[PDB]
Amino acid sequence: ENKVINFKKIIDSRGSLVAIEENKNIPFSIKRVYYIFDTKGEEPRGFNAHKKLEQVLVCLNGSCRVILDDGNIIQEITLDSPAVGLYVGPAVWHEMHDFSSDCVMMVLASDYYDETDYIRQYDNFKKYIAKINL
Amino acid sequence: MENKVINFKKIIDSRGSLVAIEENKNIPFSIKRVYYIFDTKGEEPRGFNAHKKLEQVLVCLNGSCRVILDDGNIIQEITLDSPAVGLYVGPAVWHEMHDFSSDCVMMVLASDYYDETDYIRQYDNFKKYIAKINLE
Ligand SMILES: Cc1cn([C@H]2C[C@H](O)[C@@H](COP(=O)(O)OP(=O)(O)O)O2)c(=O)[nH]c1=O
Ligand SMILES: Cc1cn([C@H]2C[C@H](O)[C@@H](COP(=O)(O)OP(=O)(O)O)O2)c(=O)[nH]c1=O
């Protein structure tokens, strides 16, 4: 798989614009939108996977280093353009690293926040996969 | 505001800050589209129009921007500059975006897909448009 989504960009004298439509340029319906900013420290994040949740990650400013693990393949990608999406399907583990100081990271979700949809142990993540594989 | 301006609950920890918007929860409508303006330049604005059905929430994710709202009746201006603050733009509300900082990133939550046909690009028209509404 290739989980990158290159969004259609509009350009003019004024700037750039990108539009994201649920079930249009993204495979799911948007129920939530969240973002990280004014970041500090050197601790990364993510380190989990969901069971039902489908999301798309967008680095609206600065850049961030993201790693994805479908259980089969691990893909490291550096997000440094707002016209690039990252699709994090269900059962896909993820981590965000190297956040720029000026970074703004945005996530689009298929569902509302649910602490219970978070698999926080890689090992378990892996286990879960197998079972799926079965 | 008691209506137009929204304050989202923001979370601050050792790693940074985080804001979360949930459709028909912290925002009165259903999220359908999400677009964003970035890498801006020049001294010519954006906006200048109204919608008949489209509802939106503007949010300045980085840098700042000056937005003027006009329900026909009253005019309101507000400088957006904190990702935690949302600006509700209901239907029949004319709007304009100004003074985008160089590092500006404006995001916009919309209730529906892009549709040229729901725009009102003419002030006057907006005015007439309005006028009417009142009647009814
Ligand atoms: C991502 C997200 C987080 N939050 C909350 C939960 C946390 O207390 C904080 C986000 O931190 P989070 O990145 O989920 O890390 P952790 O759970 O390890 O603290 O804000 C929401 O309310 N909604 C969301 O959509
Ligand atoms: C806002 C938006 C615009 N667009 C398109 C419509 C236009 O072709 C282009 C520019 O948007 P807009 O700023 O409204 O253009 P202008 O005022 O110069 O006419 O982007 C989409 O495709 N989807 C969207 O969600």
If you had to describe this structure to a student in words, what would you say it looks like?
The structure is a homodimer. The first copy, chain A, is 9% helix and 47% strand. With 134 residues, chain A is mainly β. Chain A is built from one helix and twelve strands, in the order ββββββββββββα. In chain A, 32% of the residues are buried. Chain A has one domain: Sandwich (Jelly Rolls). Chains A and B meet through strand 3, strand 4 and strand 11 of A and strand 3, strand 4 and strand 11 of B. The complex binds thymidine-5'-diphosphate (2 copies). One thymidine-5'-diphosphate sits at the interface of chains A and B. Chain B: This is TDP-4-oxo-6-deoxy-alpha-D-glucose-3,4-oxoisomerase. Chain B: Mediates the isomerization of dTDP-6-deoxy-D-xylohex-4-ulose into dTDP-6-deoxy-D-xylohex-3-ulose in the biosynthesis of dTDP-3-acetamido-3,6-dideoxy-alpha-D-galactose, a glycan chain of the S-layer. Chain B: It catalyses: dTDP-4-dehydro-6-deoxy-alpha-D-glucose = dTDP-3-dehydro-6-deoxy-alpha-D-galactose.
Q: Could you give a short description of this structure?
A:
Chain B: It is an enzyme of class 5 (isomerase). Chain B: This is TDP-4-oxo-6-deoxy-alpha-D-glucose-3,4-oxoisomerase. Two copies of one chain form a homodimer. The first copy, chain A, has 134 residues and is mainly beta.
